[PDB]
Design a protein around this ligand. Structure first.
Ligand SMILES: Cc1ncc(COP(=O)(O)O)c(/C=N/[C@@H]2[C@@H](O)[C@@H](OP(=O)(O)OP(=O)(O)OC[C@H]3O[C@@H](n4cc(C)c(=O)[nH]c4=O)C[C@@H]3O)O[C@H](C)[C@H]2O)c1O
Ligand SMILES: Cc1ncc(COP(=O)(O)O)c(/C=N/[C@@H]2[C@@H](O)[C@@H](OP(=O)(O)OP(=O)(O)OC[C@H]3O[C@@H](n4cc(C)c(=O)[nH]c4=O)C[C@@H]3O)O[C@H](C)[C@H]2O)c1O
Ligand SMILES: [Cl-]
Ligand code: NA
Lengths: 366, 361
């Protein structure tokens, strides 16, 4: 104990320490190969992640923002084409739209799911709408049925932002296989997290998959040639290998998260706290509580040596980078942003720690 | 087979240190924007003689972010060499700027500075200089024009790590500079990697934000940015290798000298080094280029072309395909690169020179 009592929001050392021997073995394998980019590890991980999601194709890319940006670029929509998207998602969802010179059309979530309210989408469809981007926020899959029907009615693409929901299931399909194309983040904090920036795109469409590979490789499908004006967005061999190791435990890990979320849901009882009771399958990337006393709560937990993070306190429309959206009246989204706080959760989290989080919350008088 | 660029041989020198640092990073529990990135950035900045180094995700991203940060208007013009790698041009068009393509000097393979001014217009906002194949571009006139015309100078340093011009390094010859650390570059990562260098405090801070979703501070986005970061692991691997970069570049100098002193074949035009050349690519030029590549291949010598189709002739740039750039076009029809690397063995480079001398067409 001679190397150098605070409960960290997400202890990645502890999550990853289980795999250190394997990571090192695979690193040395890569060194032996002399190949660090677009190699056998990327191919292997792609194949395995496609199988996991139930899709035909997976393309490793540099991060989850790029994965969304690439999808939208591949569709080659006109300037100011409209993409419907939840108002309360992480900003990178919206950045991917505006970077492609599309107009985001911000929809309120359901207060009881934190995910886009499907019943509010149709009224905002216009002749410029080209896609709906669903986000499975915090880990909970969106109620996809009406959204799929609407996409079909209006000949819209469905783009899934799966950054927070790796392996969740709606009816008979995995997230990643509920629309036309899907972006994932494997940022280290995610349920399946790399040791660096990393992402993917999933799809069943052969042409789309091919076009994405070229677009993510300078626009080059063949050495020396550039069919498209592309970008550089690749998944390193090293990261692909690390992800493949962890992917073998991802269902087991997510079910362990479910066990801890269900402990919180059943054991936390405080009139000042609204618990995130799930309406659909939830893999609990984030365990988000809601209170009118949010900053007080975070200070209270900190005083009791529990670290928390807010996801999120400023919604995209109120950010300085989007002053042209600051006017929008989105009171549900705004309320959420004032009131949410995330509690520590992870698949390797200690019983004494989750028991403390619950007990400390129960004791909170505000 | 003799490989064009044997990266296993180059990187095997550092395996024990790479493994140590990887394990240190595991011990840290921090993989993004941590101590390794800071350390490498600080050392690379010192290496280039600049105030600020921002690790980013790759070379293309480096150039894209520099241009994004300047907030140019759609169709603003950026003067750039026509014969550079296509990613220099992709950075420009990604920002909805217009690449104004200038012929190189056949004696440097770099932008001909005497051909820049005639192409400057009210829309010109920048010159992108590229230090192609390892050789620094002649900046004197470029600096004068930038001053006269209120242009930014952006350096694409992806092929010329460490090259020197007068009292300065590439990276410190303009307003801001992009670097690739793709594994094949003179300083190569074990993955995709890049940086931006600059002396301007405000610009540097803006670039940091822009490469981090546009966020300077947790929770807040000042700008509509990208996610373009240099991983801790890659920063570590680069910082190990950086200590040997000048030495590695001198090793390439030695091989290039051997080629220059020993290849004697009337069918082959050899490269010169008017200004400092770190010899990322050793580029020969012949009317029988495909023939030569095939011949070398029959002799178990792998080569690559840099490059056979110029940016303006690419299908992605249809609207440029009509542009008449005969110097650039002729170069693309005639160049081939010979194997060169800091670790390349004597017997291997002697064979390349000998087989080239035997090419009797
Ligand atoms: C819906 C949606 N769409 C697109 C995206 C874009 O994907 P991306 O481009 O891959 O980021 C996201 C990203 N989403 C996340 C976003 O939710 C937010 O996550 P966060 O929990 O606030 O992030 P964090 O604080 O950096 O890390 C969480 C915890 O993990 C610990 N940690 C972290 C790191 C990096 C480490 O090395 N060591 C650690 O111990 C520290 C913290 O306790 O910001 C991230 C940078 C984004 O990737 C998204 O949610
Ligand atoms: C002027 C300028 N500006 C911007 C850029 C953009 O930088 P980037 O976004 O960081 O790529 C470049 C990149 N420029 C290079 C470009 O010159 C070209 O380089 P190349 O020599 O044709 O590339 P390569 O064939 O992939 O590798 C060279 C040799 O190295 C071996 N190798 C390679 C890898 C990756 C490996 O893992 N193991 C190996 O053994 C195989 C080959 O024999 O293509 C690259 C993808 C670009 O990064 C440029 O030159
Ligand atoms: Cl022969
Ligand atoms: Na990367």
């Amino acid at each position: 104990n001679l190397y150098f009592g605070h409960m960290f929001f997400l202890n990645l050392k502890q999550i990853n320490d289980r795999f250190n021997t394997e990571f090192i073995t695979k690193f040395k394998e890569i060194l032996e190969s002399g190949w660090y980019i677009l190699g056998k590890q990327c191919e292997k991980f792609e194949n395995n992640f496609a199988k996991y999601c139930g899709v035909k194709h997976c393309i490793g890319v540099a991060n989850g923002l790029d994965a969304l940006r690439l999808i939208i670029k591949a569709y080659d929509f006109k300037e100011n084409d409209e993409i419907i998207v939840p108002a309360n998602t992480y900003i990178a969802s919206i950045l991917a739209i505006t970077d492609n010179k599309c107009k985001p059309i911000l929809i309120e979530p359901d207060i009881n799911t934190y995910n886009i309210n499907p019943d509010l989408i149709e009224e905002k469809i216009t002749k410029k709408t080209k896609a709906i981007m669903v986000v499975h926020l915090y880990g909970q899959v969106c109620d996809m049925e009406k959204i799929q029907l609407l996409a079909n009615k209006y000949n819209l693409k469905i783009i899934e932002d799966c950054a927070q929901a790796h392996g969740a299931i709606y009816k008979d399909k995995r997230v990643g296989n509920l629309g036309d194309a899907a972006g994932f983040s494997f940022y280290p904090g995610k349920n399946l997290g790399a040791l660096g920036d990393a992402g993917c795109i999933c799809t069943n469409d052969d042409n789309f998959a091919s076009k994405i590979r070229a677009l993510a490789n300078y626009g080059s499908h063949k050495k020396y040639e550039n069919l498209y004006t592309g970008l550089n967005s690749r998944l390193d061999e090293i990261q692909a290998a690390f992800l493949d190791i962890k992917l073998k435990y991802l269902d087991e890990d997510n079910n362990k998260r479910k066990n801890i979320a269900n402990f919180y849901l059943q054991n936390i009882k405080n009139e000042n706290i609204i618990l995130p009771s799930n309406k659909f399958d939830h893999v609990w990337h984030l365990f988000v509580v809601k209170t009118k006393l949010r900053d007080e709560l975070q200070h209270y937990l900190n005083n009791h040596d529990i670290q928390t993070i807010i996801h999120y306190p400023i919604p995209p429309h109120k950010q300085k980078c989007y002053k042209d959206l600051n006017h929008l009246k989105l009171p549900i989204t705004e309320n959420i942003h004032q009131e949410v706080l995330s509690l520590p959760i992870s698949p390797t989290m200690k019983e004494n720690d989750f028991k403390k989080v619950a007990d400390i919350l129960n004791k909170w008088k505000v």
